[PDB]
Structure formats: structure tokens, C-alpha cells
Amino acid sequence: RIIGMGDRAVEPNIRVRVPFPIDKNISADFIICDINSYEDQSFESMFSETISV
């Protein structure tokens, strides 16, 4: 099973947010995260986004 998710996705990729509100029960053996973008925001707000990922 190879699943794909993101905040701009298209079937069979599923369009969601990160982390996303409660429920939905994400689960896997491996996760590869490539989150980032797309310009821009001040440091005090950017930090809270990077650290939350």
C-alpha cells in the first residue's frame, strides 16, 4: 500500500491538511515528509509552522 497526501493533492492522492484536525486515524510503517512553501511569512509565524510539521 502506497498512500499519498498533501494540501494540494489529486486522486488517487488525497487532499488534506497537516496535521489535520482530529479523527481519520493516520497510520503507516514509514513516512516521508516533504512539506514547505510557499513564500512567505515572518520568522515568528514561520517557526511555528516548521516546528509543527
Ligand X SMILES: Nc1ncnc2c1ncn2[C@@H]1O[C@H](CSCC[C@H](N)C(=O)O)[C@@H](O)[C@H]1O
Binding-site residues for S-adenosyl-L-methionine? 8, 17-18, 38, 49
C-alpha of 14 from chain center: 11
d(CA 38, CA 26): 25
By C-beta, is 25 or 42 nearer to ligand X?
25
By C-beta, is 1 or 17 nearer to ligand X?
17
- Find which of its own copies, ligand X, none residue 18 binds, CB within 5 to 8 Å per kind: ligand X
Can you tell me which residue has the cell 494540494?
A: 8
Q: Give which of 47, 50, 38 is closest to 7, Cα–Cα.
A: 38
| Contact set with ligand X (CB under 6 A) | 6-8, 17-18, 25, 35-38
